[PDB]
Amino acid sequence: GSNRLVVDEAINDDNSVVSLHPATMEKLQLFRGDTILIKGKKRKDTVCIALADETCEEPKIRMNKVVRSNLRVRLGDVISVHQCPDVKYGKRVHILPVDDNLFDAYLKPYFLEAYRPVRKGDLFLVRRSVEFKVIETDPAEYCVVAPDTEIFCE
């Protein structure tokens, strides 16, 4: 059908997850847990994991604040989504602590077996809680974090 969706508040705060009514999912030929590149404003864009959600309105998409900012979109704006099958797991992900191993007393937990999707330039949070700017990825665009991925930053 249409690939444009009206932004809405998320109940789940996982910075890697957006939610879509299950009709919307199937109209876009998405499966639970797939990876979609959602296009935002100022030509920003991110990769997320798509969960189905009966509480989400069809012409909408539930996404948390960390995503919103990464897409620079307010509650009530209009994103577009895309199938992103070309993604593979990662090798070198560089993560600069924005606010300025104890580095990995926050970061290793957040990525442990989580298999989270990363895009060059994202900002994200880990619960005290810290923000992190992925300033380097191995495919230079987007990559997932397998248990053999290198988080070679403080």
Q: If 0-12 CB within 10 Å is exposed, 13-18 middle and 19+ buried, where does residue 151 land?
A: buried
Method: X-ray
Domain extents for the chain?
A: 4-83, 92-151
- Please list, residue by residue across 56-80, b when 16 or more beta carbons sit within 10 angstroms of its beta carbon and e when fewer do: beeebbbbbebbbebbebeeeeebe
The pair of three-digit structure tokens given for residue 77, joined into one six-digit string:
């704006």
The pair of three-digit structure tokens given for residue 117, joined into one six-digit string:
């999707």
Q: What are the distances in angstroms from CA 90 to CA 60, 94, 98?
A: 30, 11, 22
Q: Which one is the CATH code of 92-151: 3.10.20.30, 3.40.50.2000, 3.10.330.10, 3.20.19.10?
A: 3.10.330.10
Which residue in 134, 129, 19, 22 sits closest to 79, CA to CA?
Answer: 19
Which residue in 44, 51, 43 sits closest to 12, CA to CA?
Answer: 51
Give the CATH number of domain 4-83.
2.40.40.20
